[PDB]
Amino acid sequence: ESYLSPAQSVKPKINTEEKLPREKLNPPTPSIYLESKRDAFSPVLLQFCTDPRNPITVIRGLAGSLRLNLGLFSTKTLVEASGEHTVEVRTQVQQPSDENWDLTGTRQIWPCESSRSHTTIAKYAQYQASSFQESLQEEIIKFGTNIDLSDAKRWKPQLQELLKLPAFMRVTSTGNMLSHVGHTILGMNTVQLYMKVPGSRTPGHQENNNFCSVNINIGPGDCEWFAVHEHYWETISAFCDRHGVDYLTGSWWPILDDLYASNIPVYRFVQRPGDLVWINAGTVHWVQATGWCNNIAWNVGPLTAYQYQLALERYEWNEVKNVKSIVPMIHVSWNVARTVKISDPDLFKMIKFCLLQSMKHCQVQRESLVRAGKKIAYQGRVKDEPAYYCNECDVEVFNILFVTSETYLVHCEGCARRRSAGLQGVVVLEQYRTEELAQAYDAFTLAP
Numbered sequence: 368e369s370y371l372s373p374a375q376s377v378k379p380k381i382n383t384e385e386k387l388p389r390e391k392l393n394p395p396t397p398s399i400y401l402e403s404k405r406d407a408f409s410p411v412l413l414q415f416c417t418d419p420r421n422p423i424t425v426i427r428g429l430a431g432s433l434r435l436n437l438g439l440f441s442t443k444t445l446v447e448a449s450g451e452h453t454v455e456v457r458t459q460v461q462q463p464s465d466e467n468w469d470l471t472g473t474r475q476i477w478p479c480e481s482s483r484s485h486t487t488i489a490k491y492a493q494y495q496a497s498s499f500q501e502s503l504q505e506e507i508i509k510f511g512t513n514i515d516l517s518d519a520k521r522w523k524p525q526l527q528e529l530l531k532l533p534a535f536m537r538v539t540s541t542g543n544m545l546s547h548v549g550h551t552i553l554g555m556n557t558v559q560l561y562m563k564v565p566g567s568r569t570p571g572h573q574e575n576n577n578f579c580s581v582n583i584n585i586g587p588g589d590c591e592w593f594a595v596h597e598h599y600w601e602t603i604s605a606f607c608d609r610h611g612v613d614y615l616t617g618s619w620w621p622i623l624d625d626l627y628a629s630n631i632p633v634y635r636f637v638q639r640p641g642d643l644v645w646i647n648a649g650t651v652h653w654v655q656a657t658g659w660c661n662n663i664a665w666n667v668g669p670l671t672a673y674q675y676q677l678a679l680e681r682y683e684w685n686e687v688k689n690v691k692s693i694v695p696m697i698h699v700s701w702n703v704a705r706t707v708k709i710s711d712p713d714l715f716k717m718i719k720f721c722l723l724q725s726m727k728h729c730q731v732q733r734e735s736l737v738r739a740g741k742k743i744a745y746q747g748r749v750k751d752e753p754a755y756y757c758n759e760c761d762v763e764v765f766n767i768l769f770v771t772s773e774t775y776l777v778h779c780e781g782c783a784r785r786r787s788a789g790l791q792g793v794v795v796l797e798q799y800r801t802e803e804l805a806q807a808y809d810a811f812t813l814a815p
């Protein structure tokens with residue numbers, strides 16, 4: 368049933384069963400300094416970032432290296448650009464980066480209090496200033512997050528500046544899987560902006576479907592990072608379950624000494640302004656703003672055996688957990704095989720095996736349908752067309768689809784069948800004839 372071949376895994380081997388020393392558990396943060404852009408467009412750094420052995424990466428002083436203008440992202444510039452833009456606010460209590468405490472501050476705990484509000488960039492930029500104001504007068508916090516640069520109109524010069532980036536860091540690249548979904552998934556293939564005051568905290572998580580993440584500190588203020596290799600993710604999960612916080616949907620701040628006691632190595636590093644953090648596929652992380660700063664982040668799937676697997680594992684994992692994979696993987700794999708060539712021998716062979724199963728399933732789902740006497744219509748495809756999801760379970764639907772009215776809905780077989788037992792009142796369609804898929808399959812081969 369699975370779309371992956373375990374025998375094909377490009378994952379590293381960390382069968383490590385020996386308590387690593389203290390120097391191991393506080394391992395040095397992989398880091399790169401960019402003299403010149405020539406460096407930036409080098410393949411060597413691409414190698415580095417994608418290396419499955421490097422869960423996180425900080426390129427140093429990258430911005431000034433490409434001469435990227437971060438004033439475009441300054442809070443002053445954003446207010447002019449859009450003053451009334453909506454931003455969601457997360458209210459929290461200001462604490463030190465490694466600690467999360469109970470209200471009485473007696474003991475330390477995983478679950479992270481977070482409370483949503485909304486406001487305008489306008490007012491919030493005001494708060495960011497009125498906060499820094501009193502800090503001066505001296506010598507509970509609000510956090511702006513999930514602000515869309517998606518609109519290419521008012522954000523135009525903004526988005527036209529991160530085109531200076533190497534191909535693999537860009538929001539849209541023919542070599543970026545998020546680019547083959549064929550529609551917008553916000554803050555992944557769009558740019559999200561964060562405006563912070565000191566102690567602004569993002570709790571533990573992984574990127575959607577294990578996609579790599581690019582993050583650039585606008586500055587001035589520093590951002591403190593913590594991260595853990597994708598390998599340990601399910602044991603961290605185990606902590607959340609224990610503490611009654613949802614791993615995937617929940618807001619949690621890890622207790623480091625818990626992780627250390629788990630023989631779990633932790634990267635911390637500081638991100639200064641102009642520094643680009645690259646989160647590799649799979650890496651559990653959480654962040655805290657030591658300063659006043661703005662940050663910018665979007666998601667990038669590279670094309671690598673590693674990225675693809677982890678994307679697809681999480682995908683199968685979400686079906687199982689009954690969470691929605693924000694990326695329509697089977698749609699993407701097909702959309703890619705067709706558009707893009709492939710050098711990478713493991714990557715190739717992985718998408719191919721996935722496609723085969725994608726193809727094998729339709730052939731079954733159809734076969735059980737046709738002997739069930741169901742009429743299967745063919746509806747072709749429009750250009751610029753979205754992937755499909757069930758209405759109830761939110762699982763991805765590809766190829767054959769189940770439609771209902773009152774204006775139209777799409778279901779998977781199970782959720783459909785439940786509704787109507789004989790698929791009565793349901794119209795089964797095929798977006799792809801069996802030959803269509805058949806040819807596109809062997810049309811897919813290996814590029815030098």
Ligand SMILES: O=C(O)CNC(=O)C(=O)O
Binds near residue numbers: 569582664
């Ligand atoms: O930059 C921040 O505050 C949070 N960023 C992320 O979690 C990311 O880029 O993946």
Ligand code: NI
Binds near residue numbers: 573580
């Ligand atoms: Ni993240």
Ligand SMILES: [Zn+2]
Binds near residue numbers: 757760779782
């Ligand atoms: Zn369903």
